Structures are given as structure tokens and as C-alpha cells.
Amino acid sequence: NLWVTVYYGVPVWKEAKTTLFCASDAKAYEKEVHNVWATHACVPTDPSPQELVLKNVTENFNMWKNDMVDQMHEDIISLWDQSLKPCVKLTPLCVTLNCSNARSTIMGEMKNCSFNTTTEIRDKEKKEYALFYKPDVVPLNETSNTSEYRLINCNTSACTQACPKVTFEPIPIHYCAPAGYAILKCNNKTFNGTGPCSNVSTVQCTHGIRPVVSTQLLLNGSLAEKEIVIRSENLTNNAKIIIVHLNTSVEIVCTRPGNNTRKSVRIGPGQTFYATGDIIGDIRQAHCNISEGQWNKTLHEVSKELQKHFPNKTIKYERSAGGDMEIATHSFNCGGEFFYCNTSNLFNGTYNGTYINTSSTSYITLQCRIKQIINMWQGVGRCMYAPPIAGNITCKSNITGLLLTRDGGTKNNSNEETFRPAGGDMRDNWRSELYKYKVVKIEPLGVA
Amino acid sequence: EIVLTQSPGTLSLSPGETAIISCRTSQYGSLAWYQQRPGQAPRLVIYSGSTRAAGIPDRFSGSRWGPDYNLTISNLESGDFGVYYCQQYEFFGQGTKVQVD
Amino acid sequence: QVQLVQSGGQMKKPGESMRISCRASGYEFIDCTLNWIRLAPGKRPEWMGWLKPRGGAVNYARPLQGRVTMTRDVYSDTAFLELRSLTVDDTAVYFCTRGKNCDYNWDFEHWGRGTPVIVSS
Amino acid sequence: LGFLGAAGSTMGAASMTLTVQARNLLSGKLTVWGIKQLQARVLAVERYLRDQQLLGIWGICCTNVPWNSSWSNRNLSEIWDNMTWLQWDKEISNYTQIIYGLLEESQNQQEKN
Amino acid sequence: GFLGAAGSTMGAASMTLTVQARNLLSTVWGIKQLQARVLAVERYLRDQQLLGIWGCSGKLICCTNVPWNSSWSNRNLSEIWDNMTWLQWDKEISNYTQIIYGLLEESQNQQEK
Amino acid sequence: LGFLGAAGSTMGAASMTLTVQARNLLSGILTVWGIKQLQARVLAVERYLRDQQLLGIWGCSGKLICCTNVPWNSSWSNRNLSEIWDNMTWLQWDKEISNYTQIIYGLLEESQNQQEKNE
């Protein structure tokens, strides 16, 4: 009979959970020059070159049930709150504003406002001459004359300014296993959202995902390597979310004309508000350019991909369902100032004449709108103010994925939520990126 | 389109009997059963095809693997009269009622 | 205790705007996905309205396109269902509802007082 | 990362490379955000210290606990050539606390001296 | 159970030394756990280190090359073996403490010549 | 601090002062400003643990010397025994071999595995 003794160094796994720690490059105190998302406490430099393919490693993956995405989410929101902490509070601004439209389609959207403010001396007062957009101001009770307005926030909560040097685009930031843990990456391109993976590879540290923020669309992401990929919790559960990952990118450019100018305004001693001083140009509002009918081509492929999974309920598309502007409109923060665009033109049309047809005619245009005061993360009460930026702002990006829902019968909850863009949660659409990876720990002992 | 066909439509039974209601699905969703007394709010009875929900006694039971599911209610209490509904998340059927014989 | 409280019913003329409010008493309203369904004598039930009150996401049934709208106020913890162009077929009891756990967004746990809708033809 | 290469192999090849796993097992103002790296390092160090502690209490090592065949009757050749580590690890994992114990007594019998 | 050995003389306690070693190892308001963890780990590391410096790691008892003197203790074999509870002997030798520390370094080095 | 006395002497004198250096290496003696001491403690503990671990991977714990089973190449240092032992001072020899640092680091995990082919 064959009697016990313990190995050391056995290569086996246990599906443990732990706190990962990110890794990114750095060049200064604000993480390279300026910072919102980055953190140089997460050490440079990229340790991803430690990669290895493994034999016979059949392992299960589950992106829907993945949890380190949630740790990352808490990480990002805590970091953003900490970034907002030292900045100025805009509480004094909430006083009655005598306002009108612009001085002279057009930025009549802008509302001219005049109001009182304190000087450097705490007791003295001076009038002001400021400009604000319509959605950022509420008129007072209509029993009083509507010319008087107030800031939206002060009926509900406080306000805070964004610091100037705290401004930053999404950096590719890596995520590294601590000692005793390892990251497992699936390589099978046909990954169905969850299941065994055969070509599994392993890395000490993972890809540098960019912490982008968007609604209804995935942009500046990583394309798939197969054709367009579909992932869902369970398709027949109609009201659940469906995510689409593109294999080829589509270009979008957003601009607004005008040599717009801001002016600092005194608010108490030792801090100043940044108001928009004037707009100088034709300033046709915020139109965005789409890469011609390449969208017309792309929807055909997406329709074929959807048709593959389901019987012949003909695929088509529909406007956004509704709700808040973030749900109603595609949102992004490319220019520092935040953007919203009515995406009706994207999802109009159903027939093969523009869903089995391709051509290059002219860039498709989206009506858009600008807003300053914002509950940043999708409605949570972190109410903060985005300062204005000088004119000729421009942006460029590559679209990589879409968000969708589904229909079903015997509750006719949906007949066109396949045909409808979803609002979504940026947490999940990060989870749409982290599907590749999984966390695991080591156990070094055994017998034979 | 009904993809949850409760059968039989109704049953007339005295107290203490064993009521049986069959429901037929044709898709992989999964089952649950409601019930409301006349004029009262519904209550979940069976969940996941066979499991009793919270606060539901052993009288109620369910099955089976396949497209047909057999709800059963042993020892029919008079308080359990009223309309029952077949259900699976995204589906419900036409509803069926149990009454005094 | 988690509870769903419904406002009073309506009995108004057909071809009118009809409004209902429901409050998720004793619960974090923002987090869980509420739902609205119909119950009437001798009719099939019908699922009406979705509401993910965090972002205000919405979607609704085939017979209800355009006519039916709903919204919410997170501070009041109250969902609002409002139907346009009332008709005789709309006569039914309406329940604001919830699932067994806030993981499956389906109505199989909670039911309000069943505020009624009556069409005075 | 080589030790995971041994994970994808049977007992024989992995026996040649157990040490690399041990080598990698050890180590690799406003932003108080990142302080939990410290407690993570502490937990990793504690896991290593637990490994060394268990190694100490046992006194590869000619130990003396027997092995009831009920925990596994499978023969010699299976757990040399065919057997991939995760499968046998799971197989013995059913008897985990049934097979945790008397190595301390194996120390004690020689502590009689 | 190791505290059970505290409530007994030396001979019975001699069979239960290992378990004590086994257990010996392991709202910013809640961050204070880190100090306790670090200090316990440091005490354990001091133990293992000093076991190294006697040249006596791995072994719990070691044949270490310094003699005894009647000044540090004159009481005989039998009293310390049988009658003697641990805390009393610990207190008696603790009267010397640092002098009965010291020399084994050069004895480790004597065997290390 | 006596261990640094060996740094100021030749090889033989340092041959006995190895343990005194080892002893001190482990530990020593509103205001949240002071918790950086915990960082230092963690780093020192990690360095000590690296030392003990690496000694483990040679299979040479407990001892400070161990009969390790590998070739040696004169290319790293061809100089004779007497110069390296008698005249030499530690910093200079360490600098000399430091040029071959990763050329004198590597294998002996495999050497341990070699004598572990039968252990």
C-alpha cells in the first residue's frame, strides 16, 4: 500500500477572488501631465510581455458572472471622486438670474444671463454678464415672470467645479495579478460569452484597456478578429441586454465652429468661476460627421449576424426608446465638454435597399447638443460643473461596438427591442471588454 | 401567439382533493406559477418548474423536464381556490381557475 | 418592509389621458427593475411597462407603441405610468410589481393594491 | 509563467519543474486610493509563511502517514503518466479534511525521540 | 490545546509542542488590523531567523554546543522533569535572561569553522 | 554595527562575522504622517523573505554554505586563490563579479532538480 507525502510546487488552480492592481505609464504628478482616469501609484511599465500558450488547458470562462470588473468599477468611481474632492464648490452661484436669449440652426440655444456676485471684499456686490445653455438653467415658477432663472442643482444638491489641470483622455491601463494569482486569457475567437476554452493562454498582466465613457455605442475600443460577434445572457429572455462587437471600425468626427471665448469670474476670495464669455463664428451647432454609407454597409452584416441565430423575423431598427438624455442620446466626453446626439438617423430604415446595399455618398449628420452641469456617472448624484473650453473644438474616434435588446412572445414585452438601441451601463460595457480574462490562484501541494 | 397553454380550463373540486393543472411550453424559458384569490393580489406559488416559493406549503408541486409541465396541489384548501396562471419569466398563459364542486 | 403602494384608480371618459403612480415603500427604489402588468376579468394578463429607474431605461409592448408612456422620480421613489388615448379595452386592474430577486427583471414577487381603471363609455 | 506549462502536462514532466512555481510564488498625498497594495502584499506574504509553517510542522520528505485505499484505489501507472494534475487534485479534494491530520503525529512519533 | 500544556508539568507538555507553533502564525478605523498582522508576522520571522542563527531551523530541538553552569541553575534532573510547571521554571531562568542569552552565536560559529 | 567592521577588513576576518550581519538584517527599533514606517517594514520583511526563499531554491536553508553541484568558468574570474582570499576586500570582489551578475545567476535551480532526480 502506497503511503502519503506532500509535493511542493504543484501546478493546480483554485477559482479565488481578490483585489487586482492596475499598471500604467507615468510622467508627472498628474499621472503624465494631467489626470482624470490614470494613477501612477499603479506602477509603470507594461509587464504584459510575459505571455505563454499552454497545452490541453480546458477551462471555463464567464464574462457575465465576472467580478473583477466590479472592483475596477469601484476603483474608477472612487478615483474620480477623489479627483473632484479638492476642487472649488459653486454654491454661491445659486442666486436669482435675470436672463434672456442671445444678443443676435443657431446658438439661440445659449441664454444670456445677468446676476449679482460678491467682490473680493466679502460684503460688496457687483453685477455680471454671463451666458449659459438652456438645459443647464431652470426658470422659476411660472406664476412669477419666466424671465427669472436658477441653476438646476440647488433645488436638490450642491455643486462643484472641475479643476483645470484635472483633465484627461482614457489611457490604456493594464491590470496585473498579485503574487500567488494569475490571469487566464481565452484565445478562441468564437467565444460564446461563456463556456470552455481550448487555446487558453496565460499572462502575468493583461491588456491596457482604455477607461472610455459612452452611451449606446462603444468607441475607441479593440475590434474583434472574427466577423462581427454577438454576446448575450440568454437571447430568448427578450428583455435582457445584447451586445455587439464589431470586427471593422467606423469613423466618426464631431465638431462645433466658432472661436468661442471664456472669462474668469470672481466668486469669493481665492477662487473664480469659468463662464462662457462669447461665441464668435457661424457656430452651426455641434454637427457630427459619420463615414458615409459604411454604416449602411455595416448594418447589413449586423443584420445577417442576428438572422443567423433566429428564425425569419425580419431584422430592422428603430429610434432610442426614450428616457433621460443619456438613454435617449449617444453621449461622450471627447472635447472635455460633454456631448449628446439624437441618434434617430442611425437606426432609421429597414429595407434591403439600404440593408443589402453599399456605397459612398456623403457623411451622415447627427443633430447634437451640449451640456455643462452633469450627474457624471449615469445619474448618480455626483453633481459637478464642466468649465468651458476655447473654440474650434474637434474630436476623432473609431466606433467598435453597439448595444441592443431583444423581442419574444407569450409576453409581447417586445416586438422591436431587437430593433432598438439600449441605454446601457458603462460598467457592463467595460465588462464587454474584460470577457477575455479571468482570475485564479495557486495551490502548491498533492500526493501520488 | 400563446406558447403557454394551460389545460384544463377550470376544475371543480371539493376541499382536500388533489388538483392538477397541465401547462405546455415550446421554448427553453423557465417555469413559475402565480395565484390570486378573488379580488386579492397575486402570489408566486411554484418557481423553476417544481420548487415551491417562499411561504408556500408542500401541497403545491411541479414538474417536469420537457415541454409539458404538471402543476399539482394536494389537499385542496378552500383558500387556494381562484385563478392560477402558468408562467416562465417572459411567458404567461391564459390562466385557469379552481372552484368548489 | 419592502412594499408597493398604489395611488387611487380612475374612471374617466374614453379618449382621455390616464395616469397612475406607484411607490416602492421601504426599499432602495433606484436599484431594482419594476414592471407593470394588466389583470382583468376573463382576459389574458398583459405585460405593460419596463423601468430600470437608475438610468430611466424603458421599453414596452407591441400593442402599446406610442400610446403608453412611463417615467419616474428617484427622489420621490415613485414610478409613474401614464396612458394616452384611453379606450374601452383599457379597462383592467394595473399592478406595479417586482421579481423574487432583483436579478431577473420579471414580475413574479410583488403586487400592489391593484388600482382599477374603468372606462366610462 | 512556466509552471502553468506544467499545469498543462501530466505528473512526469511537471516533476522536472516544480521549483519555478515556488520562485514566482513569493513576489513580483491625495492618492491614498492605492494603499491596499500593502495589505495585498501582506496577504501574499502570509500565504507564503503558511506554506513554510506547514512544511516545518511536517519536519519532498520521508514522513510516515499511511494511506487508506478508500481515499483512492487507483494504481501506480495512472498517477504517473495519464494523470493531469487538476483531475487528481479534485479527486483527493473530496477527502480533503479526511486526508488532513496525522502528519503532525508523524512528527510526534519521531518526537518520541 | 497548547494552553492545556501550560496547565501541566514538562513531561506531558512535551508531546504537544507542535500545535502551539501551528496556531502561533495566524471605516479607516478597521485599518488597524494591519499593524497586528505585521507585528505577528515579525514575531514569527524573528523566531525563524533566530532558529537559523542557532543553526537549528527545521528541527524543533538541536544539539547546539554550549554547556550549563550551576550558577544559572543548580536544581537537578528530577525536579525539572516531573514536578515543575512551566511558568515557574520560566520565571526562574528569567532572573538570568540576558546572561543565559549570548554565547551560542560563537558555538554555531564553532561548528561552522 | 560590528558587521560593517568586516567590510573594512579582508576575507578571513569576515569569515566569522557572518552571523552578526544576519541578526540585525531582520528588524530594528493627526499624525497619520508616520505610517510610512509600515511601508519600510513590509519592504524589509519582503527582502528577508526573498533571501530565505532563494536559499530554499538552492535547497540550502539553515546553512550559510552548501555543496551545490555545478561547473565554474575562469572567464568570470581567472585570478588565483590567494589574491581573492588574502589581499582582497569585499566591495572590490563584489564589483568584479557584478559584471557577470546574471552570468553568475541562473542554473542551480536545475542543479537542485538534478540531484532531485533521485530526491
mmCIF file of C-alpha atoms in Angstrom, chain D residues 2-68:
data_model
loop_
_atom_site.group_PDB
_atom_site.id
_atom_site.type_symbol
_atom_site.label_atom_id
_atom_site.label_comp_id
_atom_site.label_asym_id
_atom_site.label_seq_id
_atom_site.Cartn_x
_atom_site.Cartn_y
_atom_site.Cartn_z
ATOM 1 C CA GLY D 2 6.445 28.213 -16.968
ATOM 2 C CA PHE D 3 4.789 26.429 -14.047
ATOM 3 C CA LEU D 4 1.477 26.840 -15.858
ATOM 4 C CA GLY D 5 3.160 24.906 -18.655
ATOM 5 C CA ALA D 6 3.491 22.083 -16.145
ATOM 6 C CA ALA D 7 -0.215 22.570 -15.394
ATOM 7 C CA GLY D 8 -0.917 21.521 -18.979
ATOM 8 C CA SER D 9 1.171 18.358 -18.602
ATOM 9 C CA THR D 10 0.995 15.158 -16.590
ATOM 10 C CA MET D 11 2.897 14.192 -13.448
ATOM 11 C CA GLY D 12 6.188 13.233 -15.099
ATOM 12 C CA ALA D 13 7.154 16.430 -16.904
ATOM 13 C CA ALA D 14 5.835 18.611 -14.077
ATOM 14 C CA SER D 15 8.087 16.733 -11.654
ATOM 15 C CA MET D 16 11.047 18.281 -13.508
ATOM 16 C CA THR D 17 9.896 21.892 -12.936
ATOM 17 C CA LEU D 18 8.227 22.310 -9.526
ATOM 18 C CA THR D 19 10.722 24.954 -8.387
ATOM 19 C CA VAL D 20 9.817 27.729 -10.850
ATOM 20 C CA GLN D 21 6.356 27.895 -9.288
ATOM 21 C CA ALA D 22 7.964 28.354 -5.875
ATOM 22 C CA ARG D 23 10.184 31.112 -7.263
ATOM 23 C CA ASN D 24 7.303 33.130 -8.705
ATOM 24 C CA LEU D 25 5.038 32.397 -5.721
ATOM 25 C CA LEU D 26 6.786 34.923 -3.473
ATOM 26 C CA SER D 27 6.862 38.317 -5.189
ATOM 27 C CA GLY D 28 6.547 40.157 -8.473
ATOM 28 C CA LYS D 29 -0.945 62.538 -0.515
ATOM 29 C CA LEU D 30 -4.243 62.617 -2.408
ATOM 30 C CA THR D 31 -3.956 59.103 -3.885
ATOM 31 C CA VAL D 32 -4.429 57.047 -0.715
ATOM 32 C CA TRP D 33 -6.534 55.064 -3.246
ATOM 33 C CA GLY D 34 -3.669 52.648 -3.941
ATOM 34 C CA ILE D 35 -2.715 51.883 -0.333
ATOM 35 C CA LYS D 36 -4.387 48.455 -0.424
ATOM 36 C CA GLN D 37 -1.354 47.171 -2.354
ATOM 37 C CA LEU D 38 0.210 46.986 1.111
ATOM 38 C CA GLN D 39 -2.405 44.638 2.556
ATOM 39 C CA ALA D 40 -2.338 42.610 -0.668
ATOM 40 C CA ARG D 41 1.413 42.120 -0.238
ATOM 41 C CA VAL D 42 0.806 41.253 3.418
ATOM 42 C CA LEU D 43 -1.724 38.582 2.444
ATOM 43 C CA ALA D 44 0.634 37.088 -0.148
ATOM 44 C CA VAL D 45 3.433 37.040 2.431
ATOM 45 C CA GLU D 46 1.070 35.376 4.897
ATOM 46 C CA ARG D 47 0.225 32.665 2.372
ATOM 47 C CA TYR D 48 3.937 32.033 1.838
ATOM 48 C CA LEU D 49 4.519 31.942 5.597
ATOM 49 C CA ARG D 50 1.682 29.443 5.965
ATOM 50 C CA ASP D 51 3.368 27.267 3.351
ATOM 51 C CA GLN D 52 6.670 27.381 5.240
ATOM 52 C CA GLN D 53 4.905 26.742 8.558
ATOM 53 C CA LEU D 54 3.153 23.636 7.251
ATOM 54 C CA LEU D 55 6.457 22.496 5.752
ATOM 55 C CA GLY D 56 8.093 22.919 9.148
ATOM 56 C CA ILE D 57 5.430 21.018 11.070
ATOM 57 C CA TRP D 58 5.918 18.034 8.762
ATOM 58 C CA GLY D 59 9.616 18.143 9.661
ATOM 59 C CA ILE D 60 9.878 16.056 -0.603
ATOM 60 C CA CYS D 61 10.112 14.184 2.700
ATOM 61 C CA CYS D 62 10.131 10.542 4.025
ATOM 62 C CA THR D 63 7.308 11.260 6.501
ATOM 63 C CA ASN D 64 5.179 8.294 7.817
ATOM 64 C CA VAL D 65 1.460 8.585 7.495
ATOM 65 C CA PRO D 66 -0.201 5.559 5.820
ATOM 66 C CA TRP D 67 -2.881 5.851 3.143
ATOM 67 C CA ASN D 68 -6.216 4.045 3.247
#
